[PDB]
Amino acid sequence: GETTDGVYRVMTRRLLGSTQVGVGVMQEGVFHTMWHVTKGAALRSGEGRLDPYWGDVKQDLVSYCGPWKLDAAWDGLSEVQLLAVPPGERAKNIQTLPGIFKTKDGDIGAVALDYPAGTSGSPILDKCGRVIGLYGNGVVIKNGSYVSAITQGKRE
Amino acid sequence: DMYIERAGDITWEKDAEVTGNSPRLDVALDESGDFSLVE
Numbered sequence A: 001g002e003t004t005d006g007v008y009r010v011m012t013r014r015l016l017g018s019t020q021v022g023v024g025v026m027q028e029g030v031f032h033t034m035w036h037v038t039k040g041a042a043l044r045s046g047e048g049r050l051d052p053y054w055g056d057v058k059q060d061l062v063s064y065c066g067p068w069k070l071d072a073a074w075d076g077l078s079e080v081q082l083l084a085v086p087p088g089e090r091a092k093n094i095q096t097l098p099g100i101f102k103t104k105d106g107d108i109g110a111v112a113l114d115y116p117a118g119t120s121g122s123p124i125l126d127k128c129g130r131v132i133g134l135y136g137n138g139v140v141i142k143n144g145s146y147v148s149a150i151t152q153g154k155r156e
Numbered sequence B: 001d002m003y004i005e006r007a008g009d010i011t012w013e014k015d016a017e018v019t020g021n022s023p024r025l026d027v028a029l030d031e032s033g034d035f036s037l038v039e
């Protein structure tokens, strides 16, 4: 299969036509996505098979072929870019200043950008192009708009 | 069966469209990975 680094669409042929259920990042031979996109199922890349390696429903993350590789973090000050990959649409970078999700266990960055459900797994990047987290797990605020957490795993 | 298709490189775009606000929200994270607003 294609192991080249980059952003990939996660597709299915189970439903009507070819449907995009999410997005992910290939880095250092490992495919990273959100748990709710694949529910931990195996993936296909051409003729090759990608088997899950690590996952966690609470963090809402999963890695394939190896351990989670992404460890860059939002610095808490600078603007970032959502590299949105919407269903049937070209990859597009959107710049934004993240807000904050304050929890009983600490704070996390959050991006107030609204996209179709099948955009889950799109990477959020810093100015060096490093992936600081994935887009697609968050909350709906008073005005009905969507705010996603900047979800990052841990590199062992 | 799910499959992947390449969609692009991961690179910062100089002069990309700048949008979205920066809300500071009190949230809770449950065992199922669902975020919710705390009031």
Ligand SMILES: NC(=O)[C@]1(c2ccc(F)cc2)CCCNC1
Binding pocket: A101, A103, A105, A106, A107, A108, A149, B029
């Ligand atoms: N302080 C943090 O970055 C954690 C966190 C996770 C999610 C969240 F919405 C806020 C905080 C805390 C628990 C485990 N490490 C991550």
Ligand SMILES: NC(=O)[C@]1(c2ccc(F)cc2)CCCNC1
Binding pocket: A114, A115, A116, A117, A118, A119, A120, A121, A135, A136, A137, A140, A146
């Ligand atoms: N499923 C959706 O349409 C929502 C969503 C949007 C973007 C995303 F990446 C994941 C989920 C979820 C909350 C309500 N409406 C938006």
